[PDB]
């Protein structure tokens, strides 16, 4: 609240009342926060790196661009919410759009009201309306064009949130309509991927810690463990880790080939059933 | 004073702050009072009618256009003082001239001050300066152009009163330099014309009254006189009046022919010496 206002004050809009310049600032303050939120949505997502590790060394578009497209749909479903929550919250606030298109209004009524105002004065005085710099001779006209431009901004924001709503609906019906499986089995697959990822993180931490303890014990002569780590060395000994081709056989896109009719829900499962 | 202000209020200037119109009003309020004062100066002068009676039935430009020119110089000396006292008192007041040439100023500084003001707005806002209708953005500019135009008006008024001063000086040196006589004899001639005109008016009233009394006495049987008129009938009887060619021999321009060297100062004197 307090720190939220103290951070929202610097990011707040300040319309530069200048023609052919304010619309560039409006485009920046709309798009560039939406762009950085979009790119950190791709950054925060981990399955993007699964995709790039799938296509870099394998160089395999052999299946199709459609499993990559469904993966990318999950990517943008995690990611692209952040640009579109910013674009609509700017558009319905309308400040960026009035600062954008204040210098594009038909000045005919303004020229009739301002005793034949010339386009050199008209475009510049149109740009000065979002700073409320209109005089008393044009304050009502500035309020009228400000309300019409606020209308256009809010209508564009509502149309954009409507079309992204129908877009997310259509990609859900596409994902369930181009599905190679049920929706109960897709839920089982989602729970399998969550269980495998959580179990794999926990066992990677445990196996890495046991390997580190064996190396340290080889160095010093002993190790410094809590009782939990003493139980870890007691329970799960290691002779050696896993080779890098065997590690490469695990990563990649989540396949759904079915070995001998029985399904394989991930590449680790494919690798385990392959042995 | 009080009635003078009550009459000066209606004749006072009211500048119509409108372009290509206010200068016509300034030209009217300068010239037309000067024109009517000039024409009533010709009307009030009686020697104009002496000139037109000299040139109408005689149709005689036989002497020259120069005695007519000296007579007309006396005409305008009596007359033309009234237009030129009006033109300078309007010009030094400056209101007619600022109302005239407010719509002719170079609007370049006004266009630079008024954010590229167009000539459609500039000429009309130039015309509105003599009503002090400039805003705060141009009040100082209106004061500057008003003072410069007041300068131009007062300088033109001073130059006009200077040139009419040198003009009246040059026509006096012309009249004394193209004089056919002395200046003492010209003073004697002026006193002769005044004495002849006054004596002729008095004896015309007296002789007309005695003729009217003789006609009335022929009608009723008597007359109604005061004691002064009784003395008038007692002193100056009339048999008959004077014929119209003899009356035409009196009127005309004041000649200065000299019969046998001895001068004749007016046409009555010429007529008397001719008998």
From Swiss-Prot, chains A, B:
Q: What is the effect of changing residue 6 to R?
A: Reduces the inhibition by ruthenium red
Q: Which InterPro entries match?
A: CALHM
Major location, coarse class?
membrane
Instruction: Extract one GO BP annotation from the record.
Output: ATP export
Point out the annotated site residues (description: Not N-glycosylated). Answer: 137
According to the UniProt record, where is the region Intersubunit interaction?
183-220
This protein's record includes keyword Repeat: no
Report which reactions are catalysed by this protein: ATP(in) = ATP(out)
**Where is it made, tissue-wise?**
Placenta.
Residues in the Extracellular compartment per record: 13-21, 102-148
What effect is documented for mutating residue 207 to A? Decreases intrasubunit interactions
Keyword set for this entry?
Cell membrane, Disulfide bond, Ion channel, Ion transport, Membrane, Transmembrane, Transmembrane helix, Transport
Membrane spanning stretches? 22-45, 71-101, 149-175
Membrane topology category: Multi-pass membrane protein
Disulfide connectivity?
15-99, 17-131
The reply on keyword Ion transport is yes
An example Gene Ontology molecular-function term:
monoatomic cation channel activity
Instruction: Give the subcellular location.
Output: Cell membrane
> Domain of life, per the record?
Eukaryota
Residue numbers spanned by region Hemichannel docking: 114-121
Q: What's the stated role of this polypeptide? A: Pore-forming subunit of Ca(2+) homeostasis modulator channels. Mediates ATP release from astrocytes and ATP-induced Ca(2+) influx in microglia thus regulating neuronal ATP and Ca(2+) homeostasis, synaptic transmission and neuroinflammatory response. May form intercellular gap junctions. The gating mechanism remains unknown.
Similarity annotation: Belongs to the CALHM family.
What does the subunit section of this Swiss-Prot or TrEMBL entry state? Homo-undecamer. Two undecameric hemichannels can assemble in a head-to-head manner to form a gap junction.
Q: What is this protein called?
A: Calcium homeostasis modulator protein 2
